[PDB]
């Protein structure tokens, strides 16, 4: 009807909303620090645009709580990462894999620290990082699922690892699942990525006797009105307060049938054309 906006421009206008084009990178890969996503370090946005051509090129992983982490970071509108001086006594830091090339040689996620044995021992790591600031801290960490029992003992000595991450409120323990998954970039192992919000007056405690993928710091969290959107439409220097994955639309009509997902001041969605 004449009251329903049914057509789109097919392009996303970068005025007045600050658009960040993910290109080959998802927000989560930019968060983790996948080497080919290094350009997104400490970037900012009103709307992050994720492309269907985005890919990962680092250690093969899963994220048990992906959607919530993605939404929390997108709503924040920033990737500001603060390095903290963790002391990891008795282990080897900065592990690298050839499935995650950083230049000519092996590498890893830039925001994560792959810890392995030193000498012939992997001690029980026990560290505490308090939040004495006035903002929320987002910690990204993970656990390594080795492919075989031999890989487990070669890396962490202990035959069964454990990652325990706590605050003053509660404690979370993850046990690795040893086993051969389908081959990805030379590896049958996997990493599971987890995350923890630490609020002012709380503390972060990490305890592990093996398989910990350690944090290097925290993301400085903020309450914002930014968002994220999956779209293949090109970014254009035009003007539009309303953005859909199909592209920008005028917001003068009361209703629109272009897309359920919208960002900015937009007409209310209806199905009727």
């Amino acid at each position, epitope marked *: 009807t004449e009251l329903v906006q049914s057509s789109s421009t097919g392009k996303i206008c970068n005025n007045p909303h600050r658009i960040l084009d993910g290109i080959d990178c998802t927000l*989560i890969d930019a968060l983790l620090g996948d080497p080919h996503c290094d350009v997104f370090q400490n970037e900012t946005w009103d709307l992050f645009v994720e492309r*269907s*051509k*985005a*890919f*990962s090129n680092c250690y*093969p*992983y*899963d*994220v*048990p*709580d*992906y*959607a*919530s982490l993605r939404s929390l970071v997108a709503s924040s509108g920033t990737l500001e990462f603060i390095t903290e001086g963790f002391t990891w006594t008795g282990v080897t830091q900065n592990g690298g894999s050839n499935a995650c090339k950083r230049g000519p040689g092996s590498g890893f996620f830039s925001r994560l620290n792959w810890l392995t044995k030193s000498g012939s021992t992997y001690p029980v790591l026990n560290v505490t990082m308090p939040n004495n600031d006035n903002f929320d801290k987002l910690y990204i960490w993970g656990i390594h699922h080795p492919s075989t029992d031999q890989e487990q003992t070669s890396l962490y000595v202990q035959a069964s690892g454990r990652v325990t991450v706590s605050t003053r409120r509660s404690q979370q323990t993850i046990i690795p699942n040893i*086993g*051969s*998954r*389908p*081959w*990805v*970039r030379g590896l*049958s192992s*996997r990493i599971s990525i987890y995350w923890t919000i630490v609020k002012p007056g709380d503390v972060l405690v990490i305890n592990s006797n093996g398989n910990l993928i350690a944090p290097r710091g925290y993301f400085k969290m903020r309450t914002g009105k930014s968002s994220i959107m*999956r779209s*293949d439409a090109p970014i254009d220097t035009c003007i539009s307060e309303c953005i859909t994955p199909n592209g920008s639309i005028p917001n003068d009509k009361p209703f629109q049938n272009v897309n359920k997902i919208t960002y900015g001041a937009c007409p209310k969605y209806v199905k009727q054309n």
Partner: antibody, heavy 129, light 109 residues
Framework: EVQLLESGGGLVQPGGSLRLSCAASGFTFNHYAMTWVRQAPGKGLEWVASSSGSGRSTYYTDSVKGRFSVSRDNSKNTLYLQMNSLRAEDTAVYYC??????????????????????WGQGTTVTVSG | EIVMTQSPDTLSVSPGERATLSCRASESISSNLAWYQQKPGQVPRLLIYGASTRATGVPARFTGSGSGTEFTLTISSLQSEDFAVYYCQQYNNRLPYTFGQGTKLEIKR
């Protein structure tokens, strides 16, 4: 609703080629591994090929290696199966199937292969002289 | 090559009676095992994953158990809709998927 719509099956001479298509809707396509399953007349289900969420990792059963090729266009939410040098033993109904998640909704496992959530309606290819 | 073997090939049981189907893996697949049901001229449908977890919408009379190399799927009381071919399947153990050869659940009379 999650839907998988298949097309491209048909009759082909031995040694011929066919391309199967699986158009997906109702879910975030690139988050899930997608795979091809075939069933010969009066026989059991057989895994053919699988593709990761990104498509950068592919796997094949031994009997189709070097002849079949799985791909996906994540901009079109479509899975493909290019079948070259077809043989009579390739006559079967071909299903595409979506991997389920493991941790529940809102999780992300594009490089793992879990119990199959949704199946296409099937497309028949017949290789004969 | 992990081999999934189902037994028996055909299981004959009266409507309303109990039925138990078995599936064995040539090596341990932990609990990465699913059961599917297929009627003639029909798409397969998921029944059990994780060896023992009923899929959404699957009636309570279906139950699975086992871990490692031996698995059982039990139907406590068969209804007309339950007579079909059942397939077990490993997933994510080095190869993405491997099916058992299937067991036909047939009406005994």
């Amino acid at each position: 609703e999650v839907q998988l719509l298949e097309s491209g099956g048909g009759l082909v001479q031995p040694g011929g080629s066919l391309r199967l298509s699986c158009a997906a809707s109702g879910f975030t396509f690139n988050h899930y591994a997608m795979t091809w399953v075939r069933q010969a007349p009066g026989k059991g289900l057989e895994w053919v090929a699988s593709s990761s969420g990104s498509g950068r990792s592919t796997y094949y059963t031994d009997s189709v290696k070097g002849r079949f090729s799985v791909s996906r266009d994540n901009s079109k939410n479509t899975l493909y199966l290019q079948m070259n040098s077809l043989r009579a033993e390739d006559t079967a109904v071909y299903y595409c199937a979506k991997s389920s998640n493991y941790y529940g909704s809102g999780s992300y496992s594009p490089d793992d292969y879990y119990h199959m959530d949704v199946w296409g309606q099937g497309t028949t290819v017949t290789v004969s002289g | 090559e992990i081999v999934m073997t189902q037994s028996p090939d055909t299981l004959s049981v009266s409507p309303g009676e109990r039925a138990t189907l078995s599936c064995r893996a040539s090596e341990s697949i932990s609990s990465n095992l699913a059961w599917y049901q297929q009627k003639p001229g029909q798409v397969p449908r998921l029944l059990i994953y994780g060896a023992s977890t009923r899929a959404t919408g699957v009636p309570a009379r279906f139950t699975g158990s086992g871990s490692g190399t031996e698995f059982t799927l039990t139907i406590s009381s068969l209804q007309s809709e339950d007579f079909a071919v059942y397939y077990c399947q490993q997933y994510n153990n080095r190869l993405p998927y491997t099916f058992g050869q299937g067991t036909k659940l047939e009406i005994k009379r």
